[PDB]
Amino acid sequence: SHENSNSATEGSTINYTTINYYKDSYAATAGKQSLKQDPDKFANPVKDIFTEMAAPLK
Amino acid sequence: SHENSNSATEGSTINYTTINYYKDSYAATAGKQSLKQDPDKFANPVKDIFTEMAAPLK
Amino acid sequence: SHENSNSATEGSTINYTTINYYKDSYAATAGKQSLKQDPDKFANPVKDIFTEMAAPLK
Amino acid sequence: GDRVADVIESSIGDSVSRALTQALPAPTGQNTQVSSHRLDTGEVPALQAAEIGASSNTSDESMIETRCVLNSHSTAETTLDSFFSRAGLVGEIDLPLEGTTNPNGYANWDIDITGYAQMRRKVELFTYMRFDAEFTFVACTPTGQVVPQLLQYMFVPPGAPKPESRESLAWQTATNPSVFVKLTDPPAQVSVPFMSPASAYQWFYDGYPTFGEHKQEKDLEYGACPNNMMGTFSVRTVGSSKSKYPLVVRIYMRMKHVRAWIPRPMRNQNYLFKANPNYAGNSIKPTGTSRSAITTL
Amino acid sequence: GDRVADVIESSIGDSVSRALTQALPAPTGQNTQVSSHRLDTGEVPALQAA
Amino acid sequence: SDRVAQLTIGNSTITTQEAANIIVGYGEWPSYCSDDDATAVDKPTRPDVSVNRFYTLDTKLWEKSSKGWYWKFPDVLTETGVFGQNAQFHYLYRSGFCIHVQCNASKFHQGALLVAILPEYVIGTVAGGTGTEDSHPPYKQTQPGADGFELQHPYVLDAGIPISQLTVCHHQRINLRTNNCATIIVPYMNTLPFDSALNHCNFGLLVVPISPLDFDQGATPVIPITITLAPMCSEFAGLRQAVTQ
Numbered sequence A, B, C: 001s002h003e004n005s006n007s008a009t010e011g012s013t014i015n016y017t018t019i020n021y022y023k024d025s026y027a028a029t030a031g032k033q034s035l036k037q038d039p040d041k042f043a044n045p046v047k048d049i050f051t052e053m054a055a056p057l058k
Numbered sequence D: 001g002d003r004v005a006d007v008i009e010s011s012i013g014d015s016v017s018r019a020l021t022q023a024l025p026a027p028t029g030q031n032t033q034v035s036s037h038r039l040d041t042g043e044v045p046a047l048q049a050a051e052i053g054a055s056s057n058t059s060d061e062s063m064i065e066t067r068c069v070l071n072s073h074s075t076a077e078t079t080l081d082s083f084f085s086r087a088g089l090v091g092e093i094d095l096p097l098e099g100t101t102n103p104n105g106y107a108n109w110d111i112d113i114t115g116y117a118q119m120r121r122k123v124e125l126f127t128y129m130r131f132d133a134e135f136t137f138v139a140c141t142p143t144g145q146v147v148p149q150l151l152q153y154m155f156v157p158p159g160a161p162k163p164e165s166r167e168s169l170a171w172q173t174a175t176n177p178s179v180f181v182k183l184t185d186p187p188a189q190v191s192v193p194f195m196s197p198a199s200a201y202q203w204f205y206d207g208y209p210t211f212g213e214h215k216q217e218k219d220l221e222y223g224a225c226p227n228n229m230m231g232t233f234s235v236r237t238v239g240s241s242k243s244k245y246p247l248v249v250r251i252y253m254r255m256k257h258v259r260a261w262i263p264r265p266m267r268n269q270n271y272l273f274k275a276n277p278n279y280a281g282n283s284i285k286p287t288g289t290s291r292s293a294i295t296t297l
Numbered sequence E: 001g002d003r004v005a006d007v008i009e010s011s012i013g014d015s016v017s018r019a020l021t022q023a024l025p026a027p028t029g030q031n032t033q034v035s036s037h038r039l040d041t042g043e044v045p046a047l048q049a050a
Numbered sequence F: 001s002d003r004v005a006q007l008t009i010g011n012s013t014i015t016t017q018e019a020a021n022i023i024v025g026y027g028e029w030p031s032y033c034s035d036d037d038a039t040a041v042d043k044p045t046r047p048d049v050s051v052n053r054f055y056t057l058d059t060k061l062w063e064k065s066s067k068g069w070y071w072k073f074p075d076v077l078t079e080t081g082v083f084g085q086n087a088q089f090h091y092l093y094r095s096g097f098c099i100h101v102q103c104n105a106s107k108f109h110q111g112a113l114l115v116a117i118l119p120e121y122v123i124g125t126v127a128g129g130t131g132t133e134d135s136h137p138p139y140k141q142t143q144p145g146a147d148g149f150e151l152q153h154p155y156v157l158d159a160g161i162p163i164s165q166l167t168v169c170h171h172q173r174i175n176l177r178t179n180n181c182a183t184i185i186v187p188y189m190n191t192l193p194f195d196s197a198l199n200h201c202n203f204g205l206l207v208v209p210i211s212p213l214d215f216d217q218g219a220t221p222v223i224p225i226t227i228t229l230a231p232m233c234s235e236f237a238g239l240r241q242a243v244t245q
């Protein structure tokens, strides 16, 4: 419990489930990540979103 | 407690008693199985069951 | 818990977070120190302190 | 003291990052819903505009007649944690007895993980990466033979003095981190933090690190990020004399706590140099293989 | 014994004849209403699509 | 209510009648640097209308055998306007961008352009062809200004990476049957909250004809392409003498 928060994800929205036997958090396991996706960020990056049914160009 | 349910029996009626030091459940021990039998499935697979005393062909 | 308080910081204002598997405390880890500074002791060691705005020689 | 309306009604100083998106939990694959025939006008989910630059928002529920499928396939193996936490070769150092490379019992190897194509192309998929690491040193003879020899693995960060020989005084490792091992013992394995002055490493730096005129003389600086130069890894045979076992140290790096930004096109041409996306312009290869005709397979 | 969703959500076996129309009583000819001048845009009751 | 657009920023205004839509890069709008993220203590100058406005670089002619062009950012605006003087007079820089590419043609012309934003578009060399020489590109070719530079090997984007997978970055497509504009809004992309405009280029703007331009003779054979770009949410810091390079 007494250990330095000094990994490269301290200050990230995702929470991990790690094992560590040291005071340095970057020595811990890779753990399990959170399963959260954002495909809209790369695949539909438009200011004015449009639906499936809507023909986009009116 | 935080570990992936990723063994080849996750989704089986039988419950195990395993030991694991990893997050991968397929690394765990073989454990103890449940002692449940179904000999009727191979030995008396008939639509119309008949008793011991009943002569089967009436 | 039963162990000799025989490290070179027993009798210091700072508290540590150590691991030990022996009864001798000097065998324990270096641990985490407390983050406490006293720069006034070396950098402004004056009997009559003066402020930033105050021109010191009146 | 703000009085005019041209500064009360302002958006200057708006530090909040306004995003159009929201990351939602996707532990499993998307399930399929039951769909029927549609025989209507106005709504056309198959006609798209790729000119917008977005991708098709279509479904199979909108394009064929489908059944309810409950997908229980996990998205947990496409994480960066799983894709990168696989120890790969990043370096290989030889400590021969004679020759031309390192005939004097020591060798320095400047850290770049861009000397073997298998791990390079996998990190060069992204532009920025922030990770801890785990290095592993597999030392042996050219023949693979294991021998009773003691080694010293010193990390020499930038600014620190590089050792000029085996009996140099930098090996005393008073503040530098070092590791001693026998080769009859298992491979060493140390964990490493994120050690750059920036918030992430970057395998592509579009620019020059130094100011000043940029001529043909010092043109080799193009692309050099000193925020990635984490220093030098040195290795010697601990001794006052010459060894008798030739040695080869192989370095195997594994990432942890990975974060990455800005994917890129993956390379389809062969690498030729380190930290340099050059290619052979005479032998340009397609990123696939060919046919003879488009109508015949 | 229907269990899958591909048969609960089905329209197979729909014997009812779905009609778009409705027969209404027309004992007499349609009457005429009083009409005025229109000098507007958007609405064009003379332009059709056969 | 989608094929028309009026982009108004500052004392400039672009009207469009044949738009597709506006792309916002990586789903983030341009912004200013927080106090959490900042490190430099100097108070930055935020000129809000004298540099956040549309500039117009030059024209490139889409001929039949055109291969492509690239423009490196913010090298395009370091000799142009009040932006390019503050960038000289200051050491740091931080701005987003709104890029706008125009190519107008008839309803009897045909063709397509890919307009992509590739961050950290590092340039490669042909290595003498053989692959033996560790040659490096000149300053004319790395940072070519607002007159841009043409691609020799556009399949690999002159870096060994394929054109096909470039649609994983920002992009729009100018299909002369469908549109004649392409609007991409780019945030600031760097590992650092601030960087120098004269040494580091944040991204490159690729313009590549995937489909060749075709017209029958009688029509107009000259089809230009004009790049029109606005800084957004610009910030400057670290004031000293003006230096050009």
Ligand SMILES: CCCCCCCCCCCCC/C=C\[C@H](O)[C@H](N)CO
Pocket (backbone or CB within 6 Å): D111, D112, D113, D114, D133, D135, D153, D154, D155, D177, D178, D179, D190, D192, D195, D201, D202, D203, D228, D229, D230, D233, D275
């Ligand atoms: C006891 C020995 C410990 C050795 C520790 C070595 C520290 C290395 C940290 C990882 C650095 C990441 C990779 C470096 C950056 C890039 O590969 C290149 N420098 C830029 O192309």
